Design a protein around this ligand. Structure first.
Ligand SMILES: [Zn+2]
Lengths: 679, 684, 684
């Protein structure tokens, strides 16, 4: 009926920040003020210890935990929970100097020097052992500290190491996966360019001066790295769990992060967390950007089948590392933070409570500016959001009931982006997926963002833009899902290769060819100056009309059972099917042969939602840039109405919600209103 | 009267592909189907063995030739010839592992790891010896196999190596060229920035962290690489010639390839072959691309004085490695293939017969798609092309009779591009030469593309765009050619330096100053937003009018006997001469002082062609984007009408011609389709 | 009343060039012709020996001075002085070969090979000793040669070395400055990302594969390189002085050069010299570029409190290293050269007297072209400038009397440009400072360009654009300056950090918050597509109107005593103060909260000039693109009228002046040609 909260100790939404009091121990007045202001702002959680290695172990084997004892006791005394971090995000300088193997070797084989962060070798037995020791200390000292509600494992795991140890490890991994060199060579088609591996010691990680044209290799390298960090993360976790199995562990994920398959890494965590820094107010409007963000929130919720996630980081204002450091306009901080909550966040947390005074993130936004207090515009909006969050306790643990699934698949992505062709100028996978998402999000229809391994049975509608790789089982599951009454939508450049990037030989859409009822003979590629158009067939079942712009990729297809919903208007393939639907069992499978404009997706998916009677957050038309999200505890529903436009927008309510809101609602620019009601 | 065919066994044009069966030995069904479709596509040649080294020598010393025996037998049983390749294009991984000396060191001094292709050390004694062994095996086993018609030496030679051994060779090379450090220091002007070399061990190839501002060094490093590869190629050929001196050998060249002077590497080959992947349909139109490709075709022919060449590689559809993988539009494959033939190819071949299933060229085009048959759009057009090429047997061996020559010179290009000034933002040498070429190509007037060392004496017209380097003899030959009644055209930034990039001191156009009858005082450099104009003087002999746009470079010249054909419209040199003609002996030498638009070139060269009465492929006006190319056996002519436009184009024939392909006489009014080509034949 | 000339031997302005006769020893006729042409162009100075190391010591220990003895004797016999150079800008090849420690190791830790220039390790004991010997030779031989008037130390010092010696040197530098690691860790806030240094050996120069996010370290790395080069240049100077303490020494500086704090380096020189290559005629107009160049001239003069400087290098035409090699238009060479003189140059010199024949600078401009004479447009204009300069003898040693100072501070720039935010897309510091300058330059108001350490007392008006870093003393001096009746102007992003890039905690703008009477709460960052507007408050003291356009950066401020002169017209801070003034003692301090357009600066600064009654070169309205500069010897004033428009421009004189160059009295209405310059003189 409702998910358990992050801890039995908490009873609503969390509000908080990364906290680095270790930078300020020379000013105890700052530490006392920090806490007074936390409570003023209604922050009830902080993440502590993240970059504290040198503050915990300034010399090898010599520890100094006192400041942390103090910090944890003070937060506890003041009713503030802690996510305690393991400090593996940044080794001390002494450790680098004494054990250089903890440093990485780059893809270009350049050895790193000490510095930066998140740049440890993941094979290094020394570093893994020091992590065990450090984590063992933190656990035996703090796993029963009443403040502590969970573990923040490392920080923002990322990157790759090509040192000789990592090469050895990679060779072993390959040898476990394919059992003979025979299997490997076949899987990679290595006879091409006489790349035949005749001994295991010949295998090597990719490099610009060596080999980076063997797709199978590049792909498995990414899988291998995923397994490296997943094992690294498990090992970090275990000494912690040994002292207290009841404390949950997470690690903080990044925006559409490419290095690791988060579906794999997620299987080692108790709950999901991520870090979101959208470049608000940098484009024509914030609508697209909002939908892109919202889709990733959904992904984060989907990784544990609806279980709420933590927004571990975000800025209250601007960042320090983007081309511009734009201020969030008044209201937008509430709106962006509530958007996380709207799609399943049970905590809104920020990077930095208090701005660092020196170093590279001193101009990153925080709750407490350099001016030393929170009587600033930023501070006041943070505090105001604190109030709002504390007033949303019933939303904590509530579920998102999505009947729509969109596939975003890391392995497909990796093999697609690595491939040479069919548009080396850019495929824009993230963006394309999101373009599909946007037409649903515009209607306030809930979406889960699964990968191709997830079970399709609970859904009415499954959408797979550019599912380039169709692994074993996937086409069968899809086919079964449609047959049983499901509806499927796939696009151009789906069903092309298998697990190791070998093309199918049965004609393209491959394992999906029978369900889609079409053959994709060839794909045309378009420059950024070129276009085609798609126009609906009179009487077509979705009422598509247009014409709509088609850009970048246009496939030439042949009907094999499917009927044409729309045709191309231009080029040598003019008059040919552009959009099709196929009847398969009691379901229907749609195919979209070209990359089309926003209007196309809006027409296509609003028709398809009307026909399928998909549930919406509110049953009323939403103006452009206004969206709606719904969470429920089984007893009430909570509707998040959001206005990403930069002017006022008015919505008509189809029923009564809670006192009681008027029948007709003006949302301010960047406004948000939460409507509640019994089901 | 007519060149020899590639083999005594063949009787017409060849049609084929690179073929890689060794990737498919686990599916014998595929190998059978391969050959069936090959015949059904009218493919009569395959290149075999190019990347087969690990398929031939999986361990050091141990060979496995059975599969190749089978392929060659099967192709021969089915009436398909073979260009058998030496596999030095890609060494096996064991070889890299055991003998790392085979790997290169980059210009940035980064050593390469195993992988990629075409990236072997050209000094390495071990690699050269391993290649000798392999090539000896191949020759001894197959040099008399009835399938084999020729040798495909390596694959797309290219790149450079800076390992200590190559540095050693480079020092020896330099010392044999200049005898003393005195001559070298003077040649390169090394006193500048105190770069005087006082010992041969101080000489080093260019590097970004070392020396790359000494122009003479950069130039000779390129010359040195050229000779390294020419020697490498000779050594490869010899054990093959040793088993059978009658088999020809080629190596496949690249599009306007910059690394090596192809005029030197061609001297070791029997015939010329190249690989062409123009980005069709990616621009406003395909006209300029078409002429650019045509010009290179002419160069490939010219390299051996009119001898037909092989189009060793092309795509039937798209490539895998460009920004876009555009499909050839219906008809364009036919047209781009027949273009190669029109300008002297006696073979049309494709990169890949069958798509690789995996690895980096899996989405490169081929005859046989992953779908496993050739009843596809690409397939059907390849097959149709195969029909047309079998119908064009009489064209094989025919000649291209060009009375115009254009100079494209690798050494001049190298020194000109390496220079600091006069426009670092871009000189666009290949593009500039081709801009000249296009005004002739648009008229159906044949052109050879010679370098500055070729003999000028058979030509009526010689054109030299940006002949920056004028080596010893060139100025003299040019002058003689004009004096004897020839016509010569040179542009801005010609006659600037000598063999080692030393500027002439006698005023610029240097050695060409007398014949041109002008002094080029100074060259002005213009941003991409800045322009000038050129306008005809009233009564000028070429009938030049305009105004025409001038961009990028504008020279300030002084008449010294020459007359002004046109003047500048704008800037502080407005009213000054911009185009000139000079009478010298019985001939005329023209100079164009600024980089002018396509319209300028058209007026200039159509006027000049009319006046000179240059022969055309057809004596009728050709619409824009329609071209005509002529080949001849001395008895008949074969006219290739080509429409590069994306719509229909209708032309009138001023004579009666036969349809060599479909039979009968063509009508007088002839509509070429979009991307169309039609072949007219007629007795002289 | 007037500064001393560079030497007791000279009596007016110098006119000359870098001269490299050592490239031409095989053609004595050239060396004779050189000197004849040098006098014909009225060139009275040459810089000699700059890249002559291998011409002076072709083997280790073994010298060859005879060609130089010759050269110096011949120049002296022909009334031409010499800045003799020390040749440390380019080591010989043998020295690199035998002592590899003289080569640099790059920021990326890649070790350099021999080649290039200005790329010596500055810690290298061998290279410093070799420089000691070589300089000691030159000095003992030539310190009393009658031709020699100064020392040209090295050539354009630049770059950095990261070899293990320089790392050691750096650790000793940091230890001598911080004393303990405690202090260092605190200054750099190194507890951030666990960067706490626990041993001096852990410290390392920045790198891309190591550490380059610690600002404290990046900033101190640049201070350390400044000290390294300052010491290196001292050490070069001392043997020269030891032989003749009367000979002045300079080193030639570069355009807004970033690697070194020139205020530190200048302390070691007797006089200032620099090298100017503006890209004239490459933009919409040359006005902005001209103001930008003028500002640097003023900076060069300000380095020694008004002491005239040497324009050591410039081109007579084009360069070889820019995207385009544009020709200076007719008149522009005169104007660009006289601009240097108008802002305090007592010498106008060019890179290269005679074009090198062979290396990378062979297409860099020079007085003598490859054509071998100076009867060329370029030569003629050089000669004509020669005349003009000789006619301006009285200007030599004259002063610039500026009551306005702009702050250009290296340390502030470093720390600001290294910061992450508030606009990584670009802060454009040089351009922003110059935007302020232009509004004054446009009025012909003189400006000294100081750093934040200079004494402010002599000025009426001090302008600090983006004074990001406010070091100890600066805020107090500024506040004192205002309090005493001074007027201060500051912008957005001033008063943010201290000496080690630690943020202030009182509220921005930190130490200037009292004097400015505002609090800057936050700064907003705008994409290149976005703008806001600034509009004057009715009855504001400066008569600001607008709206003006604001870009890139806009701060939200709060008034704390100051009054608003303007407000924003857009975004969420619309209606908020955008421009403010504060009364503080007898002065007024202005704050400009956003980066505004040209028209704002014009309105702001013309109103502020009229109100303050600042002195103009001429008391007349100047057309757009027409500027005026004033020098004085205490008796007369020399006014340089300058037209950077490409068309005629007419100006009304408010008094009567003599034409010092051409003679007689000028009228009250005067029309300057395109790129025209007229020099007006008059008694005070
Ligand atoms: Zn590693």
């Amino acid at each position: 009926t409702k998910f358990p909260l992050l801890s039995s100790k908490i009873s609503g939404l969390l509000h908080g920040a990364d906290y680095n009091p270790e930078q300020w121990l020379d000013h105890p007045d700052v530490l006392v003020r920090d806490v007074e202001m936390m409570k003023e702002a209604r922050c009830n959680v902080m993440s502590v210890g993240i970059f504290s290695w040198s503050a915990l172990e300034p010399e090898e084997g010599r520890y100094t935990f006192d400041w942390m004892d103090q910090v944890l006791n003070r937060l506890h005394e003041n009713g503030i929970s802690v996510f305690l971090a393991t400090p593996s995000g940044a080794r001390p300088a002494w450790m680098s100097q004494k054990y250089p193997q903890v440093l990485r070797v780059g893809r270009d084989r350049v050895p790193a020097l000490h510095g930066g962060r998140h740049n440890h070798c993941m094979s290094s037995p020394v570093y893994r052992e020091k992590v065990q020791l450090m984590n063992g200390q933190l656990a035996k000292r703090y796993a029963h500290h009443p403040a502590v509600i969970g573990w923040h494992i490392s920080n923002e795991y990322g990157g790759e190491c090509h040192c000789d140890t990592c090469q050895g490890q990679f060779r072993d991994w390959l040898k476990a996966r394919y059992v003979t060199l025979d299997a490997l060579n076949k899987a990679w088609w290595s006879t091409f360019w006489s790349h035949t591996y005749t001994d295991w010691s010949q295998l090597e990680s990719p490099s610009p001066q060596g080999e980076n044209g063997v797709h199978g290799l590049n792909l498995d390298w990414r899988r291998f790295n995923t397994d490296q960090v997943t094992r690294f993360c498990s090992e970090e976790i275990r000494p912690l769990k040994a002292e207290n199995p009841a404390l949950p562990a997470t690690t903080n994920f990044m925006e559409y992060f490419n290095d690791y398959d988060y579906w794999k890494l997620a299987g080692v965590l108790d709950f999901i967390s991520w870090d979101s820094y959208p470049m608000w107010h940098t484009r024509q409007d914030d609508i697209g950007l909002a939908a892109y963000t919202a889709m990733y929130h959904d992904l984060m919720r989907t990784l544990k089948q609806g279980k709420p996630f933590v927004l571990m980081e975000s800025t209250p204002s601007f960042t320090n590392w983007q081309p511009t450091s734009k201020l969030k306009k008044p209201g937008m901080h509430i709106l962006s933070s509530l958007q996380a909550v709207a799609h399943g966040a049970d905590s809104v947390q920020y990077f930095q409570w208090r701005k660092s005074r020196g170093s590279c993130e001193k101009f990153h936004g925080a709750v407490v500016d350099h001016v030393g207090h929170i009587d600033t515009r930023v501070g006041r909006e943070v505090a105001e959001l604190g109030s709002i969050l504390s007033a949303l306790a019933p939303v904590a643990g509530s579920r998102v009931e999505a009947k729509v699934a969109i596939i975003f698949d890391w392995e497909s992505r990796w093999a697609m982006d690595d491939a040479m062709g069919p548009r080396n100028a850019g495929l824009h996978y993230e963006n394309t997926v999101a373009d599909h998402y946007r037409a649903l999000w515009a209607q306030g229809i809930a979406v889960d963002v699964i990968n191709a391994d997830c079970d399709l049975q609970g859904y009415d509608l499954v959408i797979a833009p550019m599912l380039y790789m169709v692994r074993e089982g996937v086409g069968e599951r899809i086919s079964a899902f449609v047959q049983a009454g499901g509806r499927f939508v796939a696009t151009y450049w789906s069903g092309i290769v298998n697990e190791t990037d070998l093309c199918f030989l049965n004609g393209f859409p491959g394992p999906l060819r029978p369900v889609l009822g079409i053959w994709a003979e060839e794909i045309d590629s378009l420059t950024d100056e070129q276009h085609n158009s798609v126009a609906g067939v009179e009487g077509n079942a979705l009422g598509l009309s247009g014409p709509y712009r088609a850009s970048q990729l246009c496939e030439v297809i042949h009907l094999e059972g499917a009927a044409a919903l729309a045709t191309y208007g231009d080029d040598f393939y003019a008059g040919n099917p552009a959009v099709t639907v196929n009847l398969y069992g009691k379901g229907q499978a749609y195919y979209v042969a070209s990359r089309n404009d926003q209007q196309f997706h809006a027409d296509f998916f609003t028709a398809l939602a009307k026909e399928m009677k998909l549930p919406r957050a509110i049953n009323t038309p939403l103006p452009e840039g206004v969206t709606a999200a719904r969470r429920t505890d089984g007893e009430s529903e909570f509707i998040f109405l959001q206005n990403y436009n930069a002017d006022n927008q008015t919505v008509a309510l189809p029923q009564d919600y809670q006192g009681n809101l008027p029948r007709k609602l003006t949302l301010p620019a960047f406004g948000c209103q939460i409507l509640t009601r019994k089901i």
